[PDB]
Design a protein around this ligand. Structure first.
Ligand code: DUP
Ligand code: MG
Ligand code: MG
Ligand code: NA
Length: 326
DNA sequence: CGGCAGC
DNA sequence: CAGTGC
DNA sequence: GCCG
């Protein structure tokens, strides 16, 4: 019953599309209002519906699906029998505004709520009257770019620009696009670049020089999260734009990790997000702990040279990245 | 029922 | 820190 | 929202 234990290709044959589309609207509404645990239950139910092997015929049949309970089976049959979901007609008027505000990179549910209770209703209100962090100011000026997904091929060019720049300093550096790119998706919301060195030595100073190299050449246009540490890993989030006409500003995430942590970092950064949460929860039930750095016990780091070792240690069959798209 | 991933 | 996003 |  664990998502991390099954191939996400089951979702490709979604036999209940018009039901999950309406539930997705409700899930998004609960999210932007900060009710994260109710949102999480809807997300879980929707993946369960997407991978069910047939159309849901009845209340009893919907309840036979792990992740579907009484209240969800009720809504499934309401849609199945009426083509409509009455719950959608009573969503608060604030929700689309809170969604608009939380689409700004750097403004979450609490910031969106604060701006709404100040009377703000549009982006023009935020621009002219809201006090913005430097991050939110960059998220606001690239609002429409950051909402658009990029073709697979553009992410390739972005990773290549980072790779060649990193290898100009040390030709041994290994660079890998992760996230939705490594999962084989046709489009990517951002580019997630994982960097390590197989010599196993610490390379503290290279990252700083890599980032200035990308700024000096005009590729990096803004910082969102400047270089920072996470244990022995280093992380940067920023804004790049490929050269030439008709290019959008794209978000770029770069993590540098010691080789000893490569498999677990690669596993995390490949996702999906719900795959990771499912897998980490499974580890917790087995007295273990899974993070970006390591698989541990309740803490002894267990040796994980490759992703397959994590799957094995958790009793899970291996899944190619494309089968983790939950 | 409290947990719901873990940085 | 919080808030935030990955 | 759902569940061990
Ligand atoms: O909440 C999260 C978000 C991301 N992650 C991991 C998995 C995800 O694949 C990876 C990169 O995060 P992104 O936001 O870039 N998601 P993804 O690349 O899967 O999709 P997109 O095409 O939207 O970038 O970080 C989590 O573990 N938990
Ligand atoms: Mg991504
Ligand atoms: Mg903090
Ligand atoms: Na946001």
């Amino acid at each position: 019953k664990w998502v991390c234990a099954q191939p996400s290709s089951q979702k490709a044959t979604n036999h209940n599309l018009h039901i999950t589309e309406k539930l997705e609207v409700l899930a998004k509404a609960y999210s932007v209002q900060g009710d994260k645990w109710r949102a999480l239950g809807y997300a879980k139910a929707i993946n369960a519906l997407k991978s069910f092997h047939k159309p849901v015929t009845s209340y009893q049949e919907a309840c036979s699906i792990p992740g579907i309970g009484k209240r969800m089976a009720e809504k499934i049959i309401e849609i199945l029998e009426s083509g409509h979901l009455r719950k959608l007609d009573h969503i608060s008027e604030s929700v689309p505004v809170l969604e608009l505000f939380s689409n700004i990179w750097g403004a979450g549910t609490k910031t969106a709520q604060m701006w709404y209770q100040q009377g703000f209703r549009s982006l023009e209100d935020i621009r002219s009257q809201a006090s913005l962090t430097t991050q939110q100011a960059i998220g606001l000026k690239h609002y429409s770019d950051f909402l658009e997904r990029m073709p697979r091929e553009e992410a390739t060019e972005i990773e290549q620009t980072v790779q060649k720049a990193a290898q100009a300093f040390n030709s041994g550096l290994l660079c890998v696009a992760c996230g939705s790119y490594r999962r084989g998706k046709a489009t990517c919301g951002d580019v997630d670049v994982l960097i390590t060195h197989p010599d196993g030595r610490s390379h503290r100073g290279i990252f700083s020089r890599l980032l200035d190299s990308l700024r000096q050449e005009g590729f990096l246009t803004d910082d969102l999260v400047s270089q920072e540490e996470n244990g022995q890993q280093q992380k940067y989030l920023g804004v790049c734009r490929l050269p030439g006409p008709g290019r959008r500003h794209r978000r770029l995430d770069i993590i540098v990790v010691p080789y000893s942590e490569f498999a677990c970092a690669l596993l995390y950064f490949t996702g999906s997000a719900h795959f990771n949460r499912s897998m980490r929860a499974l580890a917790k039930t087995k007295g273990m702990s899974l993070s970006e750095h390591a698989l541990s016990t309740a803490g002894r780091v267990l040796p994980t040279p490759t992703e397959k070792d994590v799957f094995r240690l958790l009793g899970l069959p291996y899944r190619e990245p494309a089968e983790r798209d939950w």
